[PDB]
Amino acid sequence: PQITLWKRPLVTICIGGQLKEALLDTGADDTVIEEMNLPGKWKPKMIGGIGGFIKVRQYDQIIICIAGHKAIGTVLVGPTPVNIIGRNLLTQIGATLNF
Amino acid sequence: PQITLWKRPLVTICIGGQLKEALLDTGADDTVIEEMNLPGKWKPKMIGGIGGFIKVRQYDQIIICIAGHKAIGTVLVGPTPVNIIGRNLLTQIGATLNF
Numbered sequence: 001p002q003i004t005l006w007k008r009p010l011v012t013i014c015i016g017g018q019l020k021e022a023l024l025d026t027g028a029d030d031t032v033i034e035e036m037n038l039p040g041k042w043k044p045k046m047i048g049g050i051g052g053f054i055k056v057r058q059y060d061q062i063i064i065c066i067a068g069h070k071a072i073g074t075v076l077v078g079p080t081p082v083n084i085i086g087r088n089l090l091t092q093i094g095a096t097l098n099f
Numbered sequence: 100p101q102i103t104l105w106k107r108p109l110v111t112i113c114i115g116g117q118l119k120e121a122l123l124d125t126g127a128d129d130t131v132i133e134e135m136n137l138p139g140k141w142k143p144k145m146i147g148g149i150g151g152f153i154k155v156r157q158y159d160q161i162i163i164c165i166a167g168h169k170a171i172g173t174v175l176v177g178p179t180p181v182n183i184i185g186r187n188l189l190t191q192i193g194a195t196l197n198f
């Protein structure tokens with residue numbers, strides 16, 4: 001599809017068996033999902049942006065369905081205000097920015 | 100151009116007549132540039148990102164060239180970790196997400 005940028009580019013995702021709304025975010029290196037009780041091993045991490053840093057749990061090889069497209073990779077879970085699909089998964093669903 | 104996302108979508112911008120590097124950021128509503136001298140009037144504003152809220156200087160109707168494309172719009176100047184070109188200006192240069 002083509003997504004214009006008049007509005008936030010939110011799409012439906014499925015992660016850990018739950019549907020969420022998430023931003024397709026070219027400005028994010030990594031995918032950051034709001035606090036959820038995801039199973040399995042993880043590694044502590046801190047990630048920084050406007051305002052400072054949040055503490056997240058880094059999970060590897062997590063399956064996510066993004067707007068009907070499958071992806072698998074690192075997901076950071078923590079107290080983000082919005083669910084963020086970052087470049088690590090955007091590449092996997094074939095996303096480009098065009099102008 | 101068409102821009103893939105295996106690397107950060109960094110471009111050269113011209114702002115205040117000065118060249119800077121900035122990140123094309125579909126997850127940003129607004130364009131936020133690091134502290135710099137920029138001509139004319141501004142208003143104090145607060146914006147929030149992943150790590151909380153910061154104070155910025157809001158400049159309206161700023162002439163900015165983004166990878167050679169002309170925009171004129173709002174630029175927030177403040178302590179952002181990274182120069183970010185947000186949707187307010189991505190829409191001006193006709194940027195869409197595609198997959």
Ligand SMILES: CC(C)CN(C[C@@H](O)[C@H](Cc1ccccc1)NC(=O)O[C@H]1CO[C@H]2OCC[C@H]21)S(=O)(=O)c1ccc(N)cc1
Binds near residue numbers: 031048129130131
């Ligand atoms: C600042 C960027 C270099 C990085 N950010 C992604 C960015 O798209 C966030 C993504 C974002 C979106 C909403 C809320 C928090 C974070 N947007 C953002 O800060 O935008 C601000 C400027 O416009 C406003 O509109 C949205 C918030 C304001 S980030 O969220 O901080 C971030 C940092 C590290 C990772 N792995 C993932 C994301």
